[PDB]
């Protein structure tokens, strides 16, 4: 009877719960674990957020709307910032696909990113090192996100906004009526005029036709100091290598500097596949070929991660309708660089819910793509 039922209600469904509870909804929220948990995509400290963006021209004008809802965000927690404003920089050769639709993308949207040089930006960052081929673009108004602050939040705020929420329940099945959506859970039965569906990297195992492909990903923290920090105005940054491989990373926390890289990872296909941190042999030394070559007073790996990326098969997102029920709507694309959106596509869903009005156009984000 419930006006949504948010599926999963982890980093996209978090939000879509507080938005749709704040436009006045009944909502349901659940998740098979409590939602700042370690078995999605949103655990580690940080997510990187960038405005010009590299992967697309179809991306920019939600995550500048996105921005706006992390601002909007951040207001809730006076002590603890859930966006940091560290600015962005994107390291690469001058002649890359990438690097060409940030510069692309900054100027239509009139967006502040400065054009460096790779003598420029070693005078302005010593720390960062470069070949002299390279070119660097700064992004001034982007940085990063609290990804697990920002989940806490989501959901404390539609707690007391009256949302019910289930949240230790796994759903175990979708079933369709013709008014709403009916989930049954290993708990009872639960039914919704319309549904999200946001169970991220194993939606695979409650809706098993989707093209979407989970792949073990990891970042690792390694020993920095205080010249690579925010307070000495080092930078969050993507790098590419002559080799074609894209890397992250953030600005020394409290002494320890977060990489990871974005192309490779081994393809898994259950939950339990996801082997820890240091259990295969790859991790330990996976930021290494970066940090060696950019940023070489770096030193050892002290600890690291073990998260999921929820692969397409073109790496862009998939945002549609169900094909047989424009009923439910599914949120599942998101290739590894989805949570910078995590607040857009919560808010678009809510505006999904209560049929209203986009302003996005998500057609490049449709299911028919495939075939
Ligand atoms: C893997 C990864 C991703 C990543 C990243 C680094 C790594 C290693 N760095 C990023 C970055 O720097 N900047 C950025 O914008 N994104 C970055 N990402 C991607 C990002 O983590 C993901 O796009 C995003 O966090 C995942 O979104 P989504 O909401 O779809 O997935 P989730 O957060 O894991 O939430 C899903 C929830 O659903 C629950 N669930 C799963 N199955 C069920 C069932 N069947 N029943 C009920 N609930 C279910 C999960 O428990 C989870 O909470
Ligand atoms: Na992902």
């Known amino acids: 009877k419930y006006d949504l039922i948010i599926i999963g209600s982890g980093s996209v469904g978090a939000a879509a719960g507080y938005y749709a509870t704040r436009a006045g909804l009944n909502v349901l929220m659940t998740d098979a674990h409590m939602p ?33 809802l992390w601002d909007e965000l951040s207001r809730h927690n006076e002590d603890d910032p859930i966006f940091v404003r560290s600015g962005v920089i994107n390291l690469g050769p001058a002649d890359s696909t990438f690097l060409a639709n940030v510069a692309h993308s900054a100027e239509q949207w009139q967006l502040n990113v400065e054009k460096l040089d790779a003598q420029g930006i070693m005078a302005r960052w010593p720390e960062i090192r470069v070949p002299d081929n390279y070119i660097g673009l700064f992004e001034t108004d982007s940085g990063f996100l609290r990804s697990e602050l920002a989940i806490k939040t989501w959901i404390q705020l539609a707690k007391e906004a009256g949302c019910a929420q289930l949240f230790n329940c796994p759903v175990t099945a979708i079933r369709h009526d013709d008014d709403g959506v009916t989930i049954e859970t290993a708990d009872g039965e639960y039914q919704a005029k319309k549904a999200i569906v946001c169970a991220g990297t194993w939606v695979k195992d409650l809706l098993p036709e989707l093209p979407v492909q989970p792949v073990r990903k990891v970042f690792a923290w390694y020993q920095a100091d205080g010249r690579y920090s925010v307070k000495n105005k080092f930078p969050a940054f993507t790098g590419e290598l002559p080799n074609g491989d894209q890397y992250y990373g953030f600005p020394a926390e409290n002494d320890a500097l977060k990489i990871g890289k974005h192309n490779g990872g081994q393809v898994i296909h259950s939950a339990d596949e996801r082997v820890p941190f240091a259990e295969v042999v790859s991790d330990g030394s996976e930021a290494f070929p970066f940090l060696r070559n950019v940023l070489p007073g770096i030193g050892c790996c002290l600890y690291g991660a073990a998260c999921t990326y929820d ?21 599942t694309g998101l290739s590894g660089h989805g949570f910078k959106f995590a607040s857009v596509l919560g808010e678009i869903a809510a505006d999904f819910a209560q049929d209203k009005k986009s302003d996005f156009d998500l057609t490049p984000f449709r299911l028919s793509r495939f075939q």
Do not use: W
Request: a negative charge; aromatic letters at 6%; hydrophobic letters at 30%.
């Open 36 to 68: 700042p948990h370690q078995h999605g995509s949103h655990h580690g400290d940080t997510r990187l957020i960038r405005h010009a963006y590299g992967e697309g021209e179809k991306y920019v004008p939600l995550v500048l709307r996105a921005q706006m």
């Open 311 to 331: 692969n397409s098969p073109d790496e862009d997102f998939i945002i549609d309708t169900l094909p047989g029920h424009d009923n439910t709507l599914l949120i």
